[PDB]
Amino acid sequence: THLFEGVGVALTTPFTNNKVNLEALKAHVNFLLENNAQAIIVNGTTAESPTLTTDEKELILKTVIDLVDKRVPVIAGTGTNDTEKSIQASIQAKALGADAIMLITPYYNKTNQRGLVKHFEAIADAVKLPVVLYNVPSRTNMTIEPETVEILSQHPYIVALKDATNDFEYLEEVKKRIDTNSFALYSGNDDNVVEYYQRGGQGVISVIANVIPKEFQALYDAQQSGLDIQDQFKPIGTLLSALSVDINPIPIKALTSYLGFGNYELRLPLVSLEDTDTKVLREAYDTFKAGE
Amino acid sequence: THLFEGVGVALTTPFTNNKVNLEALKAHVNFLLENNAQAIIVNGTTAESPTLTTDEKELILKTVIDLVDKRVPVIAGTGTNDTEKSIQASIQAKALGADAIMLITPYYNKTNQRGLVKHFEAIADAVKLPVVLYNVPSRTNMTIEPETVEILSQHPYIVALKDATNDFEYLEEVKKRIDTNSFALYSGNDDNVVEYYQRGGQGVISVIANVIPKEFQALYDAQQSGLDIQDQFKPIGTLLSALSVDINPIPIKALTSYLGFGNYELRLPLVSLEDTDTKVLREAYDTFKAGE
Numbered sequence: 340t341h342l343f344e345g346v347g348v349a350l351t352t353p354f355t356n357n358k359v360n361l362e363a364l365k366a367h368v369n370f371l372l373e374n375n376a377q378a379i380i381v382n383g384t385t386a387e388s389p390t391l392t393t394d395e396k397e398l399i400l401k402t403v404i405d406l407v408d409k410r411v412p413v414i415a416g417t418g419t420n421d422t423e424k425s426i427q428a429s430i431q432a433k434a435l436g437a438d439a440i441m442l443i444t445p446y447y448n449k450t451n452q453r454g455l456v457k458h459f460e461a462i463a464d465a466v467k468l469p470v471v472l473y474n475v476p477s478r479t480n481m482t483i484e485p486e487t488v489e490i491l492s493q494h495p496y497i498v499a500l501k502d503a504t505n506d507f508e509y510l511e512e513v514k515k516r517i518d519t520n521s522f523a524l525y526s527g528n529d530d531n532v533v534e535y536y537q538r539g540g541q542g543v544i545s546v547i548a549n550v551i552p553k554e555f556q557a558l559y560d561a562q563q564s565g566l567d568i569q570d571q572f573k574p575i576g577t578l579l580s581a582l583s584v585d586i587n588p589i590p591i592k593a594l595t596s597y598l599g600f601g602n603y604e605l606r607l608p609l610v611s612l613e614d615t616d617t618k619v620l621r622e623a624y625d626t627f628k629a630g631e
Numbered sequence: 632t633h634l635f636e637g638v639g640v641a642l643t644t645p646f647t648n649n650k651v652n653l654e655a656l657k658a659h660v661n662f663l664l665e666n667n668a669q670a671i672i673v674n675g676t677t678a679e680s681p682t683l684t685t686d687e688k689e690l691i692l693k694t695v696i697d698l699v700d701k702r703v704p705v706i707a708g709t710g711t712n713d714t715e716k717s718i719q720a721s722i723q724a725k726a727l728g729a730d731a732i733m734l735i736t737p738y739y740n741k742t743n744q745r746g747l748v749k750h751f752e753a754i755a756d757a758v759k760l761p762v763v764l765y766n767v768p769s770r771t772n773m774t775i776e777p778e779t780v781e782i783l784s785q786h787p788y789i790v791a792l793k794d795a796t797n798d799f800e801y802l803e804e805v806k807k808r809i810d811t812n813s814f815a816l817y818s819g820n821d822d823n824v825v826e827y828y829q830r831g832g833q834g835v836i837s838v839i840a841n842v843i844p845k846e847f848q849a850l851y852d853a854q855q856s857g858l859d860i861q862d863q864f865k866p867i868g869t870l871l872s873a874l875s876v877d878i879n880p881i882p883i884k885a886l887t888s889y890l891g892f893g894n895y896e897l898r899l900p901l902v903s904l905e906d907t908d909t910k911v912l913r914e915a916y917d918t919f920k921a922g923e
């Protein structure tokens with residue numbers, strides 16, 4: 340059984356005075372649950388994981404696990420570019436009660452495909468918990484080659500790929516090598532979901548679902564029920580275009596804060612949008628909501 | 632007024648049974664000093680900094696600082712994609728006696744140009760020690776735009792750039808905006824030094840200088856004296872082509888181990904070359920040394 344199908348949320352971290360705001364975190368998670376999120380991915384890219392302390396990550400994860408209490412899978416981003424540290428974090432996430440972990444490829448150091456196999460298999464072996472691989476070449480400058488995905492999919496605990504390649508030839512090459520019944524493919528790019536779903540993907544791990552979880556999940560459910568969703572996607576597409584103004588999560592946090600979840604604060608080296616851009620983006624959100 | 636000119640070494644970390652081998656580290660540093668290295672860059676990309684523990688980094692740095700004892704600048708790689716942690720590491724590097732620190736741009740999270748300014752200035756402000764910026768888009772998928780280099784060069788403690796863009800139009804744009812007397816431009820790609828020196832660069836921070844420091848420094852000194860160094864570079868170019876077989880430092884550690892510094896071991900997620908490739912690269916090194 341897949342961990343989930345449809346829209347998983349790449350959960351943001353709410354800050355107030357550069358401190359994780361647990362009240363806002365809980366309120367945000369409650370909002371996502373109420374609006375049909377299918378999974379919560381915690382301490383990932385959108386959570387600003389590179390700038391969180393270990394104590395913050397563990398606190399956030401435990402808070403989300405306890406609040407969700409089995410309503411949807413809670414998937415802990417634990418992977419870094421250091422295999423040993425990834426092992427430690429993964430084991431601790433399991434101990435806290437995570438349903439799965441997510442492991443990005445290395446970055447900055449990178450590695451070759453043999454190294455990817457050793458890295459991911461070592462962490463999967465240690466944790467003995469479902470593992471979602473995460474491939475995002477735009478951030479890592481490396482990839483999980485389709486042959487490598489095939490090898491990894493045979494590992495008993497490696498069960499899915501968050502595929503942010505935005506490359507549909509890659510998708511087809513992966514599909515011909517894996518079994519979709521036991522190895523899920525989740526888009527890691529909100530922009531491509533219409534085609535990703537049409538081409539047999541299992542869902543998405545989404546940035547924009549932080550603020551429009553209901554509408555974004557409705558897209559998946561609509562196509563699952565046999566609707567065409569090209570027209571339904573259009574206004575979401577317009578909002579995603581507005582969201583492209585800067586590097587995620589700089590823009591999305593303009594919207595989570597707008598909805599009352601934390602202040603509009605990013606931790607260095609990230610920075611907030613300047614006021615004019617913040618206003619335009621919030622107006623785009625308002626326009627989207629008005630148009631429904 | 633520059634920390635150094637010519638060849639700085641992007642120092643490797645010698646491992647024996649996955650433990651930093653201090654005896655090999657000291658032997659390697661002594662070899663570099665004996666063979667005209669102009670600076671030693673410690674705990675950078677080539678050192679496998681992403682997989683080293685903080686205790687290991689500090690031990691390595693103190694060991695190098697104490698051994699070198701002011702013979703050449705010891706430049707501590709302390710920058711990460713977390714500004715706060717970069718501040719702590721930089722302050723500690725200063726306390727240990729580093730002459731300068733090196734700060735890569737963020738990666739994985741990345742940031743925008745305003746974020747770069749905040750990130751680098753925050754660390755520079757805290758450490759009050761010469762700072763070498765490090766731009767390597769092939770590992771970070773971001774850059775330090777020429778206008779940003781200009782802004783940063785005005786900071787009293789930001790004194791140089793390790794430029795691994797391999798973009799000579801970029802170099803010319805940077806040169807137009809900075810004062811060469813007070814802001815040094817070091818190549819971060821061994822392959823381009825002939826053109827880099829002739830376009831007015833101050834040197835290189837070098838991977839291949841881990842094993843041929845004397846020959847690589849001789850290029851810089853040769854061109855300094857007014858000689859054209861294109862033909863002199865040719866055999867080094869051939870060795871560099873052999874070194875391109877995999878992602879640094881996977882190949883260079885085949886050669887440092889061959890010279891007796893430490894075993895041929897990389898820490899995960901990196902892996903060693905397979906035996907056939909190890910043999911070919913070592914043969915290329917021997918061919919180069921023969922050929923002198």
Ligand SMILES: [Cl-]
Nearest residue numbers: 351353595600
């Ligand atoms: Cl939030």
Ligand SMILES: [Cl-]
Nearest residue numbers: 643645887892
């Ligand atoms: Cl070494």
